Design a protein around this ligand. Structure first.
Ligand SMILES: Cc1cc2nc3c(=O)[nH]c(=O)nc-3n(C[C@H](O)[C@H](O)[C@H](O)COP(=O)(O)OP(=O)(O)OC[C@H]3O[C@@H](n4cnc5c(N)ncnc54)[C@H](O)[C@@H]3O)c2cc1C
Ligand SMILES: CC1(C)c2[nH]c3ccccc3c2C[C@@]23CN4CCC[C@]4(C[C@@H]12)C(=O)N3
Ligand SMILES: CC1(C)c2[nH]c3ccccc3c2C[C@@]23CN4CCC[C@]4(C[C@@H]12)C(=O)N3
Ligand SMILES: [Cl-]
Ligand SMILES: [Zn+2]
Length: 664
């Protein structure tokens, strides 16, 4: 396809503002509709996932308007995504060759556990991704992911309105047929607000809980919560002076210690790019996905940035998520002038390994505009007691949140967001086909399982988070208990069978394994023990022994009872074919390589001979996957064959759950 510059030229021709050039790609035009079936408040990642999944599940059934107050896709924290998310993207027609032009390759999760009382000592835990011909995971700059999903939404019959705000003072939400009058202005100063008459409102305003806060006070869990402070840094081409052995920048890296952990995420950034230009680049990418352009004939990231006049650079997102019962020194002016900067640099110097680690990265000033060198956020975890009612329902962060650890935000949160999307078709149709009272009763009951799932989802994630945190207080419990149980309970079994029709059902059954009984049984024993040891103390050695033995005993039984075949020793670098810890084991599969030219990480697959990021051609042998233990010629062609295309819909198929087999 010849690249078009439709939006770049349209913007200059009319001197259009950022929100006007975006809203001009709407199927129903740039002004608001008089009526819609569903109005979505907030075009964050979940509002857009909701709208894309609702129209893809049942096209041409619901008119859907997404309202977003930002004039363009704004900055968001939350960049790490997981296989269920890539699978969703693929089911919506965008495979890795194209997504990698925009986002960073993620090849699993790595953890390092720093010993507090013995500075310099550490342990690790590594779990890999998948071969190039199986799937990928993504590190996403959020302004770009939400631009991609805006454009995809607009090409699938959804209108998205940036620079427009839901006014929750004058908006009316009701259960009476088509009872909703959604007031939409350009801001508080705006004399002429518009109304969108609608059947169903979707609160997707994130942690702000703009609508559902009207129905219940935000709810906080017992005990300590977490604080976060973070910033953006250069991404070194040469990751070899990093102080951790076998470090790779294409994992999501977790530096863990008694007070909490640090995330390290390598992702490309498109800041400094005109919005209209990005619209043309994205559009062209979708046209190449529609045409089926092979990866080696698709332009590289840097070549796209030349073509469309964009700005492109590699950065590292580094941040702390720590407990809020940490005692800080009273005066921290030696470490900075803002609190975020102060606490970040105070913690770094607390650990020689963190300081040695950070010494490979150069801070980036105000990557996302003025004041954005440092971010801080306090009291992360919360739950919305009420998530639905007559005329409305909430999704994503507006239902609850816990912690960045294991990325439940996007990847678990899309369970509520896709299920809501599916439930939206009968919700609107009930309202169009029965009188008001019966319609209301039928809808209320239809949503009972949705509210129940939401009510139980966040507390299970909270217990999962505390489980991991208390185990990060010791360099053996971290990898051999917490991490081990998270991947056994939470690895996504049978994900290659998911399609658009079963996605929501499969997603709500996952929950990162946080509902698996044996997982919760080990989690409760650790939390029950470790929480009694005060944070500023080291865990007694006998307590670690006891917890290690208890976990291992429960583990052997639940592992034997799992009928899902996995090359566990190839996936967990520290463990064998059962999930036994092995002291010296270093062997794993190798699915990636670093470009020698730009430092970007690449998937090893035969049909991709060039770097997708800078275009530099590598040697032919390099793109050979390493299977350790090995796979024959037929075992590998058998593996790649399952992950090619998702199966069609069979409404008489049983859904195979991602969680391990019950012991019976
Ligand atoms: C420090 C930290 C690190 C994290 N790391 C990760 C991670 O690595 N991976 C991960 O998956 N998750 C992560 N999360 C969680 C993740 O950030 C969120 O779960 C995710 O951004 C939720 O998105 P959302 O669509 O629910 O809402 P948001 O992305 O917050 O979007 C809400 C939208 O609503 C709009 N809005 C608000 N009010 C109005 C109005 N009145 N009218 C119109 N629009 C409105 C806002 O402009 C905004 O765009 C992290 C969270 C934190 C705090
Ligand atoms: C399930 C999968 C997406 C996965 N989900 C994880 C979560 C955390 C840590 C590791 C993983 C993995 C690695 C896996 C295991 N395999 C199963 C068959 C093919 C597949 C898929 C892939 C593979 O090649 N690699
Ligand atoms: C299991 C079931 C009760 C169910 N439980 C859910 C929980 C959350 C979201 C959706 C569901 C569904 C819809 C299902 C999926 N099953 C596929 C084979 C038979 C069946 C039964 C039914 C079906 O036809 N529809
Ligand atoms: Cl993650
Ligand atoms: Zn390169």
């Amino acid at each position: 396809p010849t690249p078009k510059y439709t939006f770049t030229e349209r913007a200059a021709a009319g001197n259009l503002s950022d929100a006007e050039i975006l809203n001009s790609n709407n199927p129903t035009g740039s002004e608001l509709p008089d009526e819609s079936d569903v109005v979505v408040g907030g075009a964050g990642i979940h509002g857009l996932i909701y709208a894309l999944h609702a129209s893809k599940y049942k096209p041409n059934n619901l008119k859907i308007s997404v309202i977003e107050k930002n004039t363009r896709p704004g900055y968001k924290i939350g960049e790490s995504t997981l296989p269920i998310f890539y699978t969703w993207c693929k089911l919506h027609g965008i495979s890795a060759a194209y997504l990698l032009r925009l986002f960073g390759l993620k090849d699993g999760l790595c953890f390092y556990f720093l010993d507090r009382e013995n500075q310099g000592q550490y342990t690790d835990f590594c779990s890999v991704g998948a071969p190039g011909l199986v799937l990928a995971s993504l590190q996403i700059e959020r302004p770009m992911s939400e631009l991609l999903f805006t454009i995809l939404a607009q090409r699938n019959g959804v209108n998205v309105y940036h620079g427009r705000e839901v006014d929750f003072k004058s908006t009316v939400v009701q259960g009476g047929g088509q009872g909703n009058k959604i007031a939409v202005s350009r801001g508080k100063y705006d004399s002429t607000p518009k109304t969108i008459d609608s059947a169903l409102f979707v609160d997707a305003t994130g942690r702000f809980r703009q609508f559902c806060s009207k129905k219940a006070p935000r709810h906080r869990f017992d005990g300590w919560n977490c604080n976060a402070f973070w910033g953006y840094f250069t991404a070194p081409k040469d990751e070899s002076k990093i102080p951790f052995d076998l470090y790779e920048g294409d994992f999501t890296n977790h530096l863990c210690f008694p007070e909490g952990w640090v995330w390290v995420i390598r992702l490309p950034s498109w800041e400094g790019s005109p919005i209209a230009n990005l619209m043309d680049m994205v559009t062209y990418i979708l046209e190449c996905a529609d045409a089926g352009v092979p990866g080696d004939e698709l332009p590289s990231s840097e070549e796209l940035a030349r073509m469309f006049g964009l700005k492109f650079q590699w950065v590292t997102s580094i941040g702390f998520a720590v407990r809020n019962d940490v005692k800080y020194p009273e005066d921290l002016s030696a470490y900075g002038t803002r609190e975020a900067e102060q606490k970040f640099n105070y913690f770094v110097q607390k650990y020689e390994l963190l300081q040695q680690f950070m010494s490979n990265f150069e801070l980036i000033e105000n990557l996302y505009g003025p004041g954005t060198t440092w971010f801080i956020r306090k009291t992360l975890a919360y739950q919305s007691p009420v998530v639905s009612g007559p005329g409305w329902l909430a999704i994503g962060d507006a239902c609850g949140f816990t912690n960045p650890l294991y990325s439940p935000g996007i990847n678990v949160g899309m369970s509520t967001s896709t299920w809501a999307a599916q439930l939206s078709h009968p919700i609107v149709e009930i309202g169009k086909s029965a009188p008001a009272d019966a319609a209301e009763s039928s809808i209320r009951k239809l949503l009972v399982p949705y509210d129940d799932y939401c009510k139980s989802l966040v507390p299970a994630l909270e217990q999962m988070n505390r489980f991991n945190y208390v185990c990060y207080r010791d360099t053996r419990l971290g990898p051999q208990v917490a991490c081990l149980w998270q991947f056994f309970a939470g690895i996504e079994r049978y994900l290659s069978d998911v399609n658009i029709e079963t996605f929501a059902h499969y997603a709500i059954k996952w929950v990162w394994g946080a509902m698996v009984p044996e997982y919760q049984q080990v989690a409760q024993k650790c939390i029950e023990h470790i929480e009694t040891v005060p944070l500023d103390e080291r865990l007694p050695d006998a307590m670690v022994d006891e917890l290690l033995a208890f976990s291992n005993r429960i583990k052997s039984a639940a592992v034997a009872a799992d009928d899902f075949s996995l090359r566990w020793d190839a996936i967990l670098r520290s463990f064998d074919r059962s999930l036994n810890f092995v002291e010296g084991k270093t062997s794993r599969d190798i699915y990636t390589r670093q470009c020698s030219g730009c430092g970007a990480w690449l998937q090893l697959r035969p049909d991709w001979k060039k770097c997708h990021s800078c275009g530099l051609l590598g040697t032919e042998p390099q793109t050979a996957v390493t299977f350790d233990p090995p796979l024959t010629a037929e075992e590998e062609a058998l593996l790649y064959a399952a992950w090619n295309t998702a199966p069609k819909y069979d409404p008489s198929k049983e859904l195979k759950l991602p969680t391990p087999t019950r012991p019976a």
